[PDB]
Amino acid sequence: PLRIVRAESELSTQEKSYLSAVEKGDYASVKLALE
Amino acid sequence: PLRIVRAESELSTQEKSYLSAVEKGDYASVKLALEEAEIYFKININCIDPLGRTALLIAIENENLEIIELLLSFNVYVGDALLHAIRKEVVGAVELLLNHQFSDFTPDITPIILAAHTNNYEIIKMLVQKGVSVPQPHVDSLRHSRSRLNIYKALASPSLIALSSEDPFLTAFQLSWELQELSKVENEFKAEYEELSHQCKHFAKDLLDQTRSSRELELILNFRNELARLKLAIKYRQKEFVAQPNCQQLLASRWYDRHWAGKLITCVFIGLMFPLLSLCYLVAPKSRYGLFIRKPFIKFICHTASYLTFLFLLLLASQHIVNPDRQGPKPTTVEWMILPWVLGFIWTEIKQMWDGGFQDYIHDWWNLMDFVMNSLYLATISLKIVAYVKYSGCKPRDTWEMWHPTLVAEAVFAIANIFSSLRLISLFTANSHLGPLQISLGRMLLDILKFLFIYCLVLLAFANGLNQLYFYYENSEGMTCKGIRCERQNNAFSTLFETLQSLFWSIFGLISLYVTNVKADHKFTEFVGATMFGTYNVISLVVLLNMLIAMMNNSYQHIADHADIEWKFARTKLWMSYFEEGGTLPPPFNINVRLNHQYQEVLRNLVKRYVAAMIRDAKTETEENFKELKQDISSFRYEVIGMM
Numbered sequence: 001p002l003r004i005v006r007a008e009s010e011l012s013t014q015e016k017s018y019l020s021a022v023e024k025g026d027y028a029s030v031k032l033a034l035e
Numbered sequence: 036p037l038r039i040v041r042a043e044s045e046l047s048t049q050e051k052s053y054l055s056a057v058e059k060g061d062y063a064s065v066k067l068a069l070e071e072a073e074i075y076f077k078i079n080i081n082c083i084d085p086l087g088r089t090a091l092l093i094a095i096e097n098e099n100l101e102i103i104e105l106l107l108s109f110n111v112y113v114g115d116a117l118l119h120a121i122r123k124e125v126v127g128a129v130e131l132l133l134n135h136q137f138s139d140f141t142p143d144i145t146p147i148i149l150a151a152h153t154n155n156y157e158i159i160k161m162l163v164q165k166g167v168s169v170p171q172p173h174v175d176s177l178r179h180s181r182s183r184l185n186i187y188k189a190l191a192s193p194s195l196i197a198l199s200s201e202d203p204f205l206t207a208f209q210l211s212w213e214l215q216e217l218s219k220v221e222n223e224f225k226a227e228y229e230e231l232s233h234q235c236k237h238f239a240k241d242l243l244d245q246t247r248s249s250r251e252l253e254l255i256l257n258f259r260n261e262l263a264r265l266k267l268a269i270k271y272r273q274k275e276f277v278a279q280p281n282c283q284q285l286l287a288s289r290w291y292d293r294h295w296a297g298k299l300i301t302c303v304f305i306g307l308m309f310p311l312l313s314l315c316y317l318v319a320p321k322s323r324y325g326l327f328i329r330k331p332f333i334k335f336i337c338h339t340a341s342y343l344t345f346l347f348l349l350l351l352a353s354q355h356i357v358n359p360d361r362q363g364p365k366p367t368t369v370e371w372m373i374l375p376w377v378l379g380f381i382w383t384e385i386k387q388m389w390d391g392g393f394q395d396y397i398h399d400w401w402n403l404m405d406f407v408m409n410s411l412y413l414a415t416i417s418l419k420i421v422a423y424v425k426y427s428g429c430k431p432r433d434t435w436e437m438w439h440p441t442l443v444a445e446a447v448f449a450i451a452n453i454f455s456s457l458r459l460i461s462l463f464t465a466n467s468h469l470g471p472l473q474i475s476l477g478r479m480l481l482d483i484l485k486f487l488f489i490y491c492l493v494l495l496a497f498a499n500g501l502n503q504l505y506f507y508y509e510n511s512e513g514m515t516c517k518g519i520r521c522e523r524q525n526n527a528f529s530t531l532f533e534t535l536q537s538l539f540w541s542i543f544g545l546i547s548l549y550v551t552n553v554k555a556d557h558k559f560t561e562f563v564g565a566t567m568f569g570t571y572n573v574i575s576l577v578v579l580l581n582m583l584i585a586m587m588n589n590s591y592q593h594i595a596d597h598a599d600i601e602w603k604f605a606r607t608k609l610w611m612s613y614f615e616e617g618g619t620l621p622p623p624f625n626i627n628v629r630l631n632h633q634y635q636e637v638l639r640n641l642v643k644r645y646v647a648a649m650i651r652d653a654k655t656e657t658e659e660n661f662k663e664l665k666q667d668i669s670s671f672r673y674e675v676i677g678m679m
């Protein structure tokens with residue numbers, strides 16, 4: 001059989017860095033992204 | 036003794052600092068070590084340590100991704116680090132290792148199989164997003180058996196079922212069954228095949244446990260007449276899927292559709308008036324009194340009362356009032372009101388035949404206990420009808436031959452009342468107190484059957500010995516009776532039949548001690564016979580009946596661990612037989628376009644909630660306290676870097 005991804009989509013290519021910023025924690029980048 | 040190292044070489048001196056640098060985390064030092072222009076520093080970057088880990092293995096062990104990227108940008112050896120990263124479940128390193136002779140992983144282990152073994156939702160999702168295929172399970176018997184087990188161990192992971200399927204319920208049922216029949220045709224990894232099937236039974240229960248409202252639970256259990264999916268789960272022996280509080284409540288609501296003393300009298304009152312409401316089902320199946328019998332609870336009471344009516348007059352067929360002794364008698368009054376019940380039971384069995392075919396129809400105990408009694412009743416009818424037309428005359432009963440057909444018919448009729456009255460215990464799976472007791476009592480009974488094969492050999496051996504010793508002294512001179520079943524027991528060990536009977540009645544102490552004597556002054560043979568009888572008594576009563584207690588006492592504890600999920604399963608099986616028409620008459624009076632879309636939407640909601648719950652539970656569990664330290668350390672480091 002061929003395993004596939006069912007009923008799912010992709011998040012983003014630029015929001016991954018924004019999420020990782022709050023994942024690791026850095027006030028500068030997190031603030032800058034929102035501002 | 037003198038000890039020296041066997042088959043080991045020394046690596047180097049310069050590389051020790053390089054290994055320590057990549058271990059500790061000196062990012063600049065490892066960059067400098069790899070920084071070689073037009074000449075190598077004689078330092079082998081792809082060197083191994085006494086511990087056996089490569090430079091890339093040390094880095095992925097310490098989670099330091101920066102040195103991992105530094106090493107990868109210099110083209111160090113790669114090809115085994117991806118599997119180690121997946122095994123360590125470091126998600127950051129997996130992506131890096133993906134967008135780029137001694138091994139510790141079996142040559143059949145693909146990265147997808149190892150990821151499914153680890154059971155990580157993120158790693159499996161990342162791997163499948165690029166497109167991977169799991170091989171289909173169908174010389175070197177060691178590798179082929181292991182390869183099959185690794186594919187099944189990775190095909191049963193809950194994450195893969197929830198991530199790639201069309202109906203996570205059906206795949207859980209089918210895979211759990213084919214993993215159960217594969218544990219017996221492969222009886223060398225049976226322990227690791229039963230457990231793999233066990234975890235596929237709880238997945239369906241957990242997926243069903245995520246229901247929020249009553250409407251969606253009904254749609255799940257009515258997918259593909261009524262309760263179509265529930266009947267499918269009973270087929271695959273899904274005990275955990277059925278013994279769940281929500282579906283138990285749903286079934287109880289249909290079943291019932293008061294106090295301890297306020298229920299027994301109500302049941303008696305309802306059962307006393309069963310014929311009226313049963314005739315109402317034939318005269319006019321309407322709401323006033325014909326729809327009452329349609330309630331499963333009401334139907335169960337009436338059938339129980341009707342069967343007790345048959346049992347009551349069965350006790351009235353042995354009252355002296357109802358007939359003298361005479362050859363070939365016409366049946367008495369009771370027999371003509373007994374015949375309808377026997378005919379109804381035979382009719383019910385024949386009706387049950389059409390959906391069976393000896394496939395799971397004869398394995399159940401209370402089907403082979405009904406076939407025997409029906410056969411006995413038919414044989415009684417045949418023998419009585421044979422004796423009626425070819426015999427007559429009020430000859431005294433003390434003159435008939437021992438093989439007279441009337442005697443045999445009476446005997447087989449008597450052997451048939453013991454089996455009809457022993458099926459009332461099958462109705463104990465409806466009481467909350469007597470229910471679990473019967474189920475647990477019938478499970479510590481295959482252990483007793485295994486213990487008979489030793490007693491039947493000891494008995495045969497001692498019977499052979501005693502008969503061989505005593506067969507020379509048979510006598511029947513001046514005695515009215517002969518055997519052990521009279522007042523003056525004699526000829527106890529003269530033949531093999533009487534010897535096998537004498538050693539059975541000695542368990543209960545019903546055989547005396549003067550049966551080991553002979554009509555001669557041979558004290559040597561009498562002493563040997565007595566010693567053999569005593570040796571048989573010792574073996575079977577203090578050595579063999581104390582190991583049956585000892586091994587039943589240590590087998591009841593396992594049965595009581597899971598005894599509510601089996602009693603509820605049996606009770607649901609009993610309940611579902613009364614839900615539909617085709618039997619709503621006591622034995623006495625016996626003669627898609629959008630449903631798929633809605634189901635898929637509910638399935639999506641259930642799968643998403645289950646994924647959220649599993650990731651929440653796995654992430655949190657002491658383990659949550661580890662993340663905060665790293666988070667605050669990283670925040671402090673970033674703050675310091677920003678200030679500098």
Ligand SMILES: Cn1c(=O)n(CCCO)c(=O)c2c1nc(Oc1ccc(/N=N\c3ccccc3)c(OC(F)(F)F)c1)n2Cc1ccc(Cl)cc1
Binds near residue numbers: 562565568570573
């Ligand atoms: C097997 N037998 C026997 O058939 N007859 C009947 C023959 C006469 O009709 C005995 O009379 C007898 C006996 N055995 C005995 O002595 C024992 C008893 C029990 C032992 N052990 N355990 C148990 C365990 C549970 C319950 C009962 C006994 C045991 O253990 C041993 F020493 F290791 F042998 C030895 N006697 C009595 C006797 C007669 C003559 C002498 Cl000189 C000495 C003793």
